[PDB]
Amino acid sequence: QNLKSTDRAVQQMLDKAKREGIQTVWDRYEAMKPQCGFGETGLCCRHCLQGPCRINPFGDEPKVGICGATAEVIVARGLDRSIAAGAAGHSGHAKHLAHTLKKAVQGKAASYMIKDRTKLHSIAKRLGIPTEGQKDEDIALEVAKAALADFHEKDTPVLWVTTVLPPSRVKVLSAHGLIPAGIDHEIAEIMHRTSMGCDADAQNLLLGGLRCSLADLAGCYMGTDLADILFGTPAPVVTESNLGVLKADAVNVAVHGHNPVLSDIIVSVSKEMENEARAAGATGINVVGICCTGNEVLMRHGIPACTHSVSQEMAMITGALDAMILDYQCIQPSVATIAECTGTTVITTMEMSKITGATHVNFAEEAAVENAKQILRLAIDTFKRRKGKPVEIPNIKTKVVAGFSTEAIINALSKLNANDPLKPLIDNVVNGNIRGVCLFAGCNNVKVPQDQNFTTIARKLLKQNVLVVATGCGAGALMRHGFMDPANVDELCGDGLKAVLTAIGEANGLGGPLPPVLHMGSCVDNSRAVALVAALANRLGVDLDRLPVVASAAEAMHEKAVAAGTWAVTIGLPTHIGVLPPITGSLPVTQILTSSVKDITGGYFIVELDPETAADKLLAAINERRAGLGLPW
Amino acid sequence: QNLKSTDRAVQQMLDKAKREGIQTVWDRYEAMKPQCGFGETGLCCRHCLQGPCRINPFGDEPKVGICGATAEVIVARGLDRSIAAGAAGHSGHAKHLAHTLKKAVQGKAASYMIKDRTKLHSIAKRLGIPTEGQKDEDIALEVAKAALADFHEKDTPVLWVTTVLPPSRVKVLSAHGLIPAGIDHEIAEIMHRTSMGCDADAQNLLLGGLRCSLADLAGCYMGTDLADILFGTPAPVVTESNLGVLKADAVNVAVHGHNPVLSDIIVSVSKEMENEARAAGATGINVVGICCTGNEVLMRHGIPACTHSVSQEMAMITGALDAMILDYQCIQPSVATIAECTGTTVITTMEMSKITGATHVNFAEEAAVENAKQILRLAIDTFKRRKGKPVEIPNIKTKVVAGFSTEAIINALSKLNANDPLKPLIDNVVNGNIRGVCLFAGCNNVKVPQDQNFTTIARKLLKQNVLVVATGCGAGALMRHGFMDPANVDELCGDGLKAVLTAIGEANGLGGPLPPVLHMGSCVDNSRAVALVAALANRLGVDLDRLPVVASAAEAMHEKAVAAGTWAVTIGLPTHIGVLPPITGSLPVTQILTSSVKDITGGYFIVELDPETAADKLLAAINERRAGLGLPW
């Protein structure tokens, strides 16, 4: 089972699933092999009913699509559509939150409110919305209206791009025509230009993709901003992760999907319903997290993380998961059929994301508490049905310190330099105690033994004194292997990095260091890493493409991960991807994405499936940035 | 060559292309056979980097996608993305026109103006924009602002849906949640819900597709509305079609693509540059049309149509095409490589639609005349280079009467009943002189011998007294085979239909009948057919799903054609498609689209590749509607 997942709790459940004849994502992968090479390489097009068209990577015909579309056009159009789909997932997420904030301050959704006034006012100031002499509710209405306005064309560009990057970076992007005009505007323009008989020049197509990736960045940053207003900016928390956070004697409820509008209410209502659960014979309601909505409630409330991404079905295989409460994105639809065998009640809540065979409970912001109680009562009913049944919860968990929003990191650093909090970090970059910064982001992928690339690469970078931050299921991978437990600093970290983590931790009243990896939150919270790096750039007076900062989507899967990798390149970062995107069928497209884009944005993709090699390439990229700043390395 | 195209001019150029070793779309199709059956059936998914996933239509594994996505989910998600892509092509087209009208009335683009005041005021009234006491420029600014506002969420739904269909139809659609909230909003929501781990219920997915198809309808109707304001509502015109409209001694300039913002200016400037062309040794500039932008200038100015859709490369093979002026959509990118062999200058004009190897001339509305002159001078240069070269223009053309906007049809009918113009048409439906109405729409497709389905089906329907209207390349197919020449009424039409066409034609001062088929314009002008049918519904006090009206996308190709077929079903029409869409790998999806959707919208798809059978099925659908109105048939 170690060839499927490096997580020992997942291995234990894979053995149980095999014993019980329950098909898993890994079994479905094996049944798909060998996968289509035209699709793997990007050399397939279905954009009109004359298709499907394919192109042989090498040899004889077919060499070109029926309409004359070349390999480079086909590959670029496919990639662009993936970027647009990822941007669309962040459009829905951020829009959901914008509408919730508007309803909250218009008196239409009393379960929601402004929890972080300071964040509200700082966002308003960043957008140019006046705050002096204004009620918070009116400031928030203006912020919500601004968020919604960034979805369409108007007299300004997308402000959740132009107000969040350094002016020098905005100027570079504007000179190449890459600033988005509107989030949904760019998504639609991609779908248009990639349709049959439209854009058919690889460079032109890929420039469009870069622009649409910035629409994805805007949606991410908007999502984080609005969630912090509504639910609070994260500060340091301690919790646990992995399947052992489930409790045989509790009603175990997983929140799974993405948006805190749902999960945050589940958390608060679950606390109100403790006695109702105890009347059913449980100890209480044990809310646990899967995927990004799990990360959201982990960061804000210390809700323990059950599992992530590719291994999500394993939480059900324990037999102890009473409900899985879903909103949208990254939910394997297999969960609805596995529920029949495992006893779990799978509940969908959003009109645009239903799964055949699941129970649907509409969740309206206006009736959030009422709807949450309905959902949780189904969970209590399900717990009652498993009275007396044996369960198999692996006794496996790790300690997780998290909650490192950018505000939290700045505050922690401020204990070393109150009026110039970024300077202690920069001081240690300059003196070599911190070699550089690496963001781990994105998914697991069934093609890669689960977590193997994240942990192999992180280990090498930490030994070389790289400050490692993580989001999404990259944070999930690292937390489940102990990388968020400060007890592992001595084993994992180079001496310079250990000295920095220790100095910061002791100045914040811990008697111990910060953890080896800083968890910066969910996938939308990749925007927090952008905020940190942009702040560093501004303090140094340079653009992001001069900073010793890199990113790694080491086990990427979702279209959202493709979009995020692309905006990482667009804002100026060397960006590793550890699975093959469908570009290898075009050398010209591959050369643009891995090389000549450096001349446009200063960033570039590093496609490398071997994680030891990827770590070396990421270190080389960091050290080249160090050299360009005249620093030793 | 008759197995490739039924057009004899195309056959002649296919022989020339073969002689000269020039590869065509048909050669590229042959080189693609056998095409992938997973793609043909819809049983392929590339929506994440764990793919590609496929499902065997029958037999053993694979049976399910890696994430658990079933065949019905995979098929529905693919179809939804196609609908969204078609909607996006109409979003770009309509948006282009909205921005042009706004610039025109803000004094920023003096080459554009309000040409149709009556249309402007009627649209304003339909939208609820006040006109009394307002300057035309302010009314137009309001209309342009309303058009742009329908792209995003606001306090009203998409008004280019809700104000153009009968209230009873709006009520049916609203009850099922199918009214779009915003054009680009729906496109993005499709891309979100179809991304990995989101919507995974076939009915839910397909309802989303129906809603997005209405966003496409809105874009079409907006495009027609705005183009009529700016360039004039069509009235009856006479011209010619097919390759013989090219002239060896003229500078032959094809306008190709979609938007009249470009082609309409080409037409007017070309007239201004006659002497400059005569100084180059030509007789003048001969502007000819390809595809929809050709239809636009045919309908408004009688510009002759050269060719359409699948046969577009053949215009170049004559050797006499000096320039091909492109904007976007349905342009085979092969044209840029064929240009090298044929001498043609291929010119792109839009930033989002470039073709490697073509010359790009930006075309800004603000500098339209200047840019048109630059483009046309390249065409004159190219004509000079072919002095003395032999050309082979097939001496083949047809006569085409066209320009039947809905306003033109109503005006023509008004000569028989001034205050109740639709009544003479309804009278003849009731008495059986007109059996029903069929709209032919959409593309040619290399899989179908060019025009064979359109002409075979049209012949059978006309003999059975069906009033036939046509748009796009369906109009192109019918015009190139004589169906728009009133001289063919006696041969083609049943006695009842002939009597009606004759009565209307003679009352409009022609001494002869209307043509056998009424050309209602470009693909966006499918919206004109909607306007006519909605007006008939309103005059009869019934919904469109009770009218004896059907549609046929007999040789469909583009994602736009899939979107149009879907909104035809959604508004209540039996809708034939003559090529296989990628749905046959899911029986549940096929059953929804061809049967159970009848219970939601009253429309349904008729998938039928044999055109004689398709004609019988369309007649059965018409006659069933007749029976439901208590009429003989």
Ligand code: SF4
């Ligand atoms: S767009 Fe071109 S390449 Fe793609 S399916 Fe259609 S004919 Fe083939």
Ligand code: SF4
């Ligand atoms: S979304 Fe599901 S079915 Fe599609 S490629 Fe990814 S794993 Fe396969």
Ligand code: FES
């Ligand atoms: S041929 Fe396999 S992905 Fe299309």
Ligand code: FES
């Ligand atoms: S397997 Fe051929 S279209 Fe994907």
Ligand SMILES: [Fe+2]
């Ligand atoms: Fe996520």
Ligand SMILES: [Fe+2]
């Ligand atoms: Fe068209």
